Design an enzyme around this catalytic site. Structure first.
Site, PDB file in Angstrom:
ATOM      1  N   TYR A   1    -106.015-166.329 105.568  1.00 54.08           N
ATOM      2  CA  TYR A   1    -106.817-166.886 106.863  1.00 54.08           C
ATOM      3  C   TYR A   1    -106.446-168.301 106.987  1.00 54.08           C
ATOM      4  CZ  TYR A   1    -109.021-162.110 106.441  1.00 54.08           C
ATOM      5  OH  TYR A   1    -109.367-160.847 106.432  1.00 54.08           O
TER       6      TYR A   1
ATOM      7  N   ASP B   1    -103.597-153.532 107.585  1.00 53.17           N
ATOM      8  CA  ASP B   1    -104.461-154.924 107.763  1.00 53.17           C
ATOM      9  C   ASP B   1    -103.641-156.079 107.463  1.00 53.17           C
ATOM     10  OD1 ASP B   1    -107.615-156.099 107.806  1.00 53.17           O
ATOM     11  OD2 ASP B   1    -106.649-156.951 106.182  1.00 53.17           O
TER      12      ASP B   1
ATOM     13  N   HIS C   1    -111.548-149.586 111.572  1.00 59.80           N
ATOM     14  CA  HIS C   1    -110.552-150.238 110.725  1.00 59.80           C
ATOM     15  C   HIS C   1    -110.041-149.513 109.795  1.00 59.80           C
ATOM     16  CE1 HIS C   1    -108.535-153.762 109.987  1.00 59.80           C
ATOM     17  NE2 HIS C   1    -108.733-153.731 108.732  1.00 59.80           N
TER      18      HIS C   1
HETATM   19  C1  LIG Z   1    -117.092-159.835 105.139  1.00 59.36           C
HETATM   20  C2  LIG Z   1    -116.471-160.165 106.495  1.00 59.36           C
HETATM   21  C3  LIG Z   1    -117.054-161.281 107.098  1.00 59.36           C
HETATM   22  C4  LIG Z   1    -115.460-159.310 107.244  1.00 59.36           C
HETATM   23  C5  LIG Z   1    -116.012-158.535 108.283  1.00 59.36           C
HETATM   24  C6  LIG Z   1    -115.041-157.757 109.413  1.00 59.36           C
HETATM   25  C7  LIG Z   1    -114.063-157.186 108.536  1.00 59.36           C
HETATM   26  C8  LIG Z   1    -112.714-156.488 109.101  1.00 59.36           C
HETATM   27  O1  LIG Z   1    -114.395-156.242 107.537  1.00 59.36           O
HETATM   28  C9  LIG Z   1    -113.739-157.333 106.914  1.00 59.36           C
HETATM   29  C10 LIG Z   1    -114.491-158.557 106.356  1.00 59.36           C
HETATM   30  C1  LIG Z   2    -106.621-159.499 114.675  1.00 62.62           C
HETATM   31  C2  LIG Z   2    -106.962-160.702 113.851  1.00 62.62           C
HETATM   32  C3  LIG Z   2    -107.048-161.865 114.514  1.00 62.62           C
HETATM   33  C4  LIG Z   2    -107.138-160.453 112.340  1.00 62.62           C
HETATM   34  C5  LIG Z   2    -105.429-160.460 111.834  1.00 62.62           C
HETATM   35  C6  LIG Z   2    -105.635-160.328 110.206  1.00 62.62           C
HETATM   36  C7  LIG Z   2    -106.307-159.277 109.716  1.00 62.62           C
HETATM   37  C8  LIG Z   2    -106.134-158.665 108.397  1.00 62.62           C
HETATM   38  O1  LIG Z   2    -106.002-158.036 110.800  1.00 62.62           O
HETATM   39  C9  LIG Z   2    -107.442-158.837 110.606  1.00 62.62           C
HETATM   40  C10 LIG Z   2    -107.656-159.378 112.018  1.00 62.62           C
END
Ligand SMILES: C=C(C)[C@@H]1CC[C@]2(C)O[C@@H]2C1
Ligand SMILES: C=C(C)[C@@H]1CC[C@]2(C)O[C@@H]2C1
Ligand SMILES: C=C(C)[C@@H]1CC[C@]2(C)O[C@@H]2C1
Ligand SMILES: C=C(C)[C@@H]1CC[C@]2(C)O[C@@H]2C1
Ligand SMILES: [Cl-]
Ligand SMILES: [Cl-]
Ligand SMILES: [Cl-]
Ligand SMILES: [Cl-]
Lengths: 289, 287
Positions: free
Chosen positions: B206, B98, B267
């Site tokens: 983010y 991730d 994931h």
């Molecule tokens: C808590 C969340 C909004 C997100 C939901 C999707 C993801 C990849 O699991 C993480 C947290």
């Molecule tokens: C694919 C994405 C836009 C995001 C990128 C960041 C993270 C932690 O990998 C998750 C989803």
């Protein structure tokens, strides 16, 4: 009969509308990112039987655009329509609402049933249905990615308007199940309406005021009176913005008799994709009780 | 056994767990995890390597600087480069999941000399996500929460209230196995999430790197090719990442590259198939 453009003061805002025909007052209410012009295929056919009125909502095209997110709360938007009915010298109207126009229509009918003769909804989820179910629907939360995007100040306005509203044009075209639904003339008319000073911010304020994360994820139950007016719900099943989870089981929201007309091969813009069938369903509902 | 340690890297104190001796092997977590996401791999990989699983900047026991700007990817990769040096090494085998994977891709591209081999678990290449997200409706939809996280204070409030019920649910919904996390696991996660300033810091990743300006940027990304042996492990049933972002990874790697697909995993592939993941990692380093 000819299509006439008019302006009228309702509450504290000057509202622009187009009108054609005579008889029972029939209101056609647009949503995002539209204006009265989304009703182009229904106005002349409906005007053969009704006094058709298609306004630009608060903040859109030729209508007044007050500053501030709080001026775009559903309560004030429903009060503009109530005010419009009165200003047109009527006690009630048949109300047809698409998208935000539909959300405003559900609100007007629930809080002022006496002002609405018949209710027509096109791809607009019931406010209690969306407030209760969205937080519990992953598929809906995903479809509503842009609702979260629109919460941010100035950045969505910039992204949506840059390169002659290319982002907006593309997101619109992607939502249609019909090929080349908008002509180059249509796109030039939409760009004119989109370009009106303060129009985009005002349009986005609907999401900031009524669909912010506090409202979506609220733990508080919603105070919303049952619908007590005969209702027709039209739903284009291939809707990219709304999940079916939000339209099913309307029983607990509507007390009055109601009907749901599903359009399995249509999307969000059902009135643009099947203009004649939509016009026919609206006409038949009003004229045949 | 498993030892907890703290070390100064750049201008932050970093907490990590460590077990084993030999080649330095870094395991980097993502959101909403911490070192504990590596619980099933740490003892098995310790048998051959010096396993180090840190808490990233802003997480659990690691320092949490205030402000969105302190969570830019450039600084997060620099923390790992700094952690490599602070552990008395020149390089390390880097495994990232991730956000840990996004940091790993960045560290490997801008500092290849500091990375012996690369292992990526369900983490899109930064150039792939920067270029492709705006062009993928499916990805923009999967990333609804990335837009939600942009808003100040409200996501923290929604995610933490009722003992992180929203977070627990969104986590459980992401697994392809219904009863993956135990009641004890969930209390361990709530403890790490409850650390003062941890949630805001985690959300700042983010806000700093995936805000709408970056997602919808018209400017192309300057990103060097990966010049280090790379292994990519991918759980195909990923709820956060579209396959559109993972296809054609070779156009980013100018070195030996292999991709192991896990079609029945999501994931959290390291939690769903812990043995197979550990085996693929072990086989890649020892060969
Ligand atoms: C808590 C969340 C909004 C997100 C939901 C999707 C993801 C990849 O699991 C993480 C947290
Ligand atoms: C694919 C994405 C836009 C995001 C990128 C960041 C993270 C932690 O990998 C998750 C989803
Ligand atoms: C389903 C939704 C969250 C939205 C609600 C608002 C709008 C304009 O009607 C569309 C769908
Ligand atoms: C501009 C947008 C992101 C949106 C996309 C989805 C919807 C329903 O068509 C509207 C505009
Ligand atoms: Cl006009
Ligand atoms: Cl149809
Ligand atoms: Cl710990
Ligand atoms: Cl599998």
């Amino acid at each position: 009969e000819m299509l006439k453009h008019e302006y009228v003061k309702v509450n504290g805002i000057k509202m622009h509308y187009v009108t054609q025909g005579k008889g029972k007052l029939l209101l056609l209410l647009h949503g995002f990112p539209d204006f009265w012009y989304v009703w182009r295929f229904q106005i002349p056919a409906l005007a053969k039987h009704f006094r058709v009125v298609a306004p630009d909502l608060r903040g859109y095209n030729e209508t007044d655009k007050p500053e501030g997110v709080e001026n775009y709360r559903l309560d004030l938007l429903a009060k503009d329509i109530l005010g419009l009915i009165k200003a047109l010298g009527e006690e009630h109207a048949v109300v047809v609402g698409h998208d935000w126009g539909g959300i405003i229509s559900w609100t007007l009918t629930a809080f002022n049933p006496q002002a609405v003769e018949k209710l027509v909804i096109l791809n607009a989820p019931h406010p209690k249905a969306y407030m209760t179910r969205t937080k519990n629907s992953l598929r809906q939360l995903q479809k509503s990615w842009y609702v979260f995007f629109f919460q941010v100040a100035n950045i969505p306005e910039k992204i949506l308007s840059r390169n002659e509203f290319a982002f907006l044009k593309n997101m619109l075209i992607q939502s249609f199940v019909r090929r080349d639904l908008l002509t180059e003339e249509d796109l030039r008319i939409y760009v004119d309406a989109w370009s009106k000073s303060g129009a985009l911010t005002s349009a986005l304020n609907y999401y900031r005021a009524n669909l912010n994360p506090d409202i979506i994820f609220s733990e508080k139950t919603v105070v919303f009176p049952k619908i007590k007016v005969p209702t027709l719900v039209i739903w284009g099943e291939k809707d990219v913005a709304i999940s079916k989870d939000l339209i099913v089981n309307m029983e607990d929201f509507i007390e009055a008799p109601y009907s749901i007309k599903y359009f399995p091969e249509c999307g969000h813009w059902v009135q643009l994709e099947e203009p004649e069938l939509v016009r026919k369903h609206i006409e038949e509902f009003i004229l045949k009780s």
